[PDB]
Amino acid sequence: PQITLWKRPLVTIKIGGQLKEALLDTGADDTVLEEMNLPGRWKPKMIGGIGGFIKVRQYDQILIEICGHKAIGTVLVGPTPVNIIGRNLLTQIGCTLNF
């Protein structure tokens, strides 16, 4: 698929048995999702952007399906205002920028 950028590049993802809308975000190294109560062990982390840092929980080897494309990797969970698919998973679905 080709996604133009006139509007936010939001897509449906599937994670932890839930469907959600998330940004395909080339500016994010890693993936950050809204607060959700996933099972398993996690590690605390702090991640920073415009405005400062938020506290998140780092979960490893999480399965996530992005527009029907399967991926597995680290997902950070916390009080982000938007679900953010970062490069750690975008590479796994073969996503490129083109101009």
Ligand X SMILES: CC[C@H](C)CN(C[C@@H](O)[C@H](Cc1ccccc1)NC(=O)O[C@H]1CO[C@H]2OCC[C@H]21)S(=O)(=O)c1ccc([C@@H](C)O)cc1
Which parts of this chain interact with ligand X (CB under 6 A)?
Answer: 23, 25, 27-30, 32, 47-50, 76, 81-82, 84, 86
Active-site residue flag, 25: yes
Contact 62, 75 (CB under 8 A): yes
Residue identified by tokens 């982390």 is 45
Residue whose C-beta lies closest to ligand X: 49
51-75 CB burial, b ≥16 within 10 A, e <16: eeebebbbbeebebebeebebebbb
Nearest one of 73, 97, 79, 99 to 24, comparing CA atoms: 97
Question: Based on CB atoms, which residue is closest to a copy of itself, 37 or 96?
Answer: 96
Give, as ranges, the residues between 4 and 43 that touch a copy of itself (CB under 8 A). Answer: 4-6, 8-9, 23-29, 32
Q: Using CB under 8 A as the criterion, which residues of the chain lie in contact with a copy of itself when the complex forms? A: 1-6, 8-9, 23-29, 32, 47-54, 67, 69, 80-82, 84, 87, 90-91, 93-99
